Design a protein around this ligand. Sequence first.
Ligand SMILES: *Cc1c(COP(=O)(O)O)cnc(C)c1O
Ligand SMILES: *Cc1c(COP(=O)(O)O)cnc(C)c1O
Ligand SMILES: [Cl-]
Lengths: 450, 449
Amino acid sequence: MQTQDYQALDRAHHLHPFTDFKALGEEGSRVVTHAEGVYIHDSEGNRILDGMAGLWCVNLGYGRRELVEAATAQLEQLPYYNTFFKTTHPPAVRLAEKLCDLAPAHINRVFFTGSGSEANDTVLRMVRRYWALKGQPDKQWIIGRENAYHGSTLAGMSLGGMAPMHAQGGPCVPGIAHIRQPYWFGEGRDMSPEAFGQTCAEALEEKILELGEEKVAAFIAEPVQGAGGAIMPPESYWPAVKKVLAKYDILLVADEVICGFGRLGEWFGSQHYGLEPDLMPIAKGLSSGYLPIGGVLVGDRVAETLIEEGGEFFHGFTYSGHPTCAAVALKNLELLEAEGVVDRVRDDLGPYLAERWASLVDHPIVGEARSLGLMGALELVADKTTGQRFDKSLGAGNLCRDLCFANGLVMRSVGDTMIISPPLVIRREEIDELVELARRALDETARQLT
Amino acid sequence: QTQDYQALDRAHHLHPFTDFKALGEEGSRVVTHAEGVYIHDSEGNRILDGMAGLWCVNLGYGRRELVEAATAQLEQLPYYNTFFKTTHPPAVRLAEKLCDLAPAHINRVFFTGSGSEANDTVLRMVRRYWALKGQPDKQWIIGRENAYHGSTLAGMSLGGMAPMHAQGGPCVPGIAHIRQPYWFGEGRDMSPEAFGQTCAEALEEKILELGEEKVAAFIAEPVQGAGGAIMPPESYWPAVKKVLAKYDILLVADEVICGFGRLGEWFGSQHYGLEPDLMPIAKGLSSGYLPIGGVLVGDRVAETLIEEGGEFFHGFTYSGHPTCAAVALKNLELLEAEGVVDRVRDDLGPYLAERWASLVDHPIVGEARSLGLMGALELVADKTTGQRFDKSLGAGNLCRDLCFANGLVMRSVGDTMIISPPLVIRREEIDELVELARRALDETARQLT
Ligand SMILES: *Cc1c(COP(=O)(O)O)cnc(C)c1O
Ligand SMILES: *Cc1c(COP(=O)(O)O)cnc(C)c1O
Ligand SMILES: [Cl-]
């Protein structure tokens, strides 16, 4: 089969995620066929540096023989069995042990799911079931943040703060509120980062008092916002949030679907900011994306009420704990740990990216460059003195994104914010190539718009 | 070791649909390997898996070809997203094969990871569709009591399980529930034919109660699975089609259990001559070997979404996962090349029915019903009246546990026993299933008397 054959069949039969179906059918889908290391290859023979590690998830890179062998061995032994029938299997047991041993203190149980979205559905039912069992059935409201992403189920979309998602397929799940996001560059340059972080934390208290603490069940947040644009909050934000949560009896849900398993230099983003969440949804890097699996790490406070008071929890998925997916996730975690990959993002690749990434701040159209661990972002501006954006209709970010791909680099755009999330095993020479290709695309972007 | 597995499992693993405390006290079963239609546990027991994992292992365990399909794709392209104006060969070929097997005018698929996520996709698609048609208040979805449509918030809301609705709500707004075509439990004051038409007429009443302008879709399993393997009277679906012909509402056929051979067709919709607008799928799509699901989308809905909708802000990281798709594709190729669906319809289905019917003369079996390789038995305390054992006696759970003790997985929904074995089960294995069931039925009857 030739590229156009794939494209024609794909156009005829395949509806892609988050896609303008009509536009893509007219321009023709890219066809990705194989990958190795940090590189992907398409049906036209192009080799591209995958600066997004698939979709924030291929932490150990492509071509890890050990993950292939883990799946093959489990498929030959027990490809599938359910965890419904008063049953478990060895992969589930061992993965839950390993996961909870890596989790922060007081987080000792896991409920398995297939995706980060199903994990957030699990979170929502667990949170509201929890308060019902506490004798407080009016404690129902969940506070998220604008521009947050918590998945694409109805619950995940409702918990998220994406207006274009909210505008499609609603009504949403009831009882979700949204406060402002700690995005200094886009929304806070009228203040010092420190003052802005405290304002955005105070917004949580304001929302609590607006709804009434007796009606609020939980606050949900990504430690660092991923899909919304790799937005690291000011250093003042999370300490001030902890101050607010200490005043009110509310659960903390840290959505670790992107930040988990090395991305920011820790096993969990919660650990980078010293949080103690009651629940933590996870997926993506859990298995380096090699097979689908997610879950909720459940803190002792929620777990004990559900166990001791709840009887049966009428919740779960056919593929919860899927033994082949669990076998792969277990091996992925063992490799991440045995090879010191997390320590290495934090002490080696993270700082190295930071210095190489910071060499882009002097580019004519880069208004800000930020990174943490192996997550990074650039802010494209038309005027550096004022920070003014290029006009929205010009699509500066999408143009830079397409020019990056044309130069051999996957670097995505959220509006006029460029983002990267490369595999955690990326080599220093490969980071060098990434920044060079980025600068080339930035050069070509600036020339075309001026 | 078994007790070592159990202690670690108790400490850290919260199971689906489980009384966490009770199971921790009793000790989890530990399943460790499987081949053919049999599973094995950490104590060395071989058990005939009359439920095919969870209604999903259609080609049975030990299929070398599915293992090789997974290994080859993991070595080629283990994962890549379909978000970035991108696709990959497995998604392309799987979408082609799937739509070629689907009913007429069902030519597109949106991939998901699970049947639950597929029903979330259904719900957003249905409501986005009518919004694009200029009817944004045409939002109500009519499901059925005792329906099962998954365990997301959307799936739980779409389902009709009161114990689920009672945990973690509020539900998604705008879902109504009409009565189920369960003749044995709820219709024995009528002929099956009249009952089937009454249950169809309940749909019309609900439409008129809500107002056709507010109703978006009717969602139903062709045959209810988790609710107790409830085949409707033969009058039901023809009468439902008459109602659907009169009103402008979408039909969603939830094929997560009925898809891919279970009833003797590629889709339960095809057994009943339905023309659905959307069909969520999962489970048998891959014989459960790897997680994957999706929504088969009819031309009516697809063209509106494509031509009017712009971007659909919906999807999952693992939508179209190329390793899972590669396995699903091979599963379909094997099911077709080996004539498994045809064999359910013409051989194993009819054979189960005759052997299954040999259980009707048992002292506590009030009804035996089957279709393809789905079957159910109704436990009763008195065959004259059909009355149940008191719920407090747990007749169904006792029979379930006695089946397992005899080497057979046969599930209980209240006092309804259900089976859904792999589609590659052989005739003598169907005999063994019925023989082992009878042993458990004898022992249940003795223990309850
Ligand atoms: C990816 C994303 C999700 C959704 O995960 P899926 O596997 O796509 O369902 C949830 N939370 C966050 C923070 C995410 O980035
Ligand atoms: C299994 C089931 C679902 C849910 O599928 P999951 O993969 O468990 O999320 C949906 N619909 C029906 C009819 C089912 O039996
Ligand atoms: Cl509000």
